[PDB]
């Protein structure tokens, strides 16, 4: 299975938030390792991993994420245990306050790989 949560994003935030920053944010918040995978689970697009950082400087809307997109964020260092993967639903809401990017407080445990 997978952990699940909703990200509350303002519209202006999807349009300004850089992918590189989004990755750091999710990694640190839920304690993933350095090597990670970020996939659009909606349409199965590998958007970022520890080997494909080419869209680093693009914003979230520039890589075609939007309201209702589901992102799957995985642990790719995965020696023996891994940080459990999480599926995050992007809730782009009007009118959330400007520059809102609220990540859900979810429990993401270590599990056997």
Author numbering: 440 to 552
Task: Give the original sentences from the paper that presented this experimental model.
The Sumo-specific E1 enzyme [the heterodimeric complex between Uba2 and Aos1 (yeast; termed Sae1-Uba2 in mammals)] initiates the process by first catalyzing adenylation of the Sumo C-terminus, which next becomes linked by a thioester bond to Uba2's catalytic cysteine. A transthiolation reaction ensues during which Sumo is transferred from Uba2 to the catalytic cysteine of the dedicated Sumo E2 conjugating enzyme, Ubc9. Therefore, to obtain a more detailed understanding of Uba2's ufd interactions with Ubc9 and to obtain broad insights into how E1-E2 specificity is established in general, we performed structural analysis of the Uba2ufd-Ubc9 complex from S. cerevisiae.
Like ubiquitin and Sumo, the Uba2ufd adopts a modified β-grasp fold. Uba2ufd consists of a twisted 5-stranded antiparallel β-sheet on one side, one 3-turn α-helix on the opposite side of the sheet, and two peripheral short helices. The β-sheet and connecting loops form one V-shaped surface. The structure of the Uba2ufd is nearly identical in the complex as on its own (0.47 Å rmsd). The Uba2ufd C-terminal “V” is minimized relative to the corresponding regions in ubiquitin and NEDD8 E1s, which would be unable to accommodate the Ubc9 β1β2-loop.
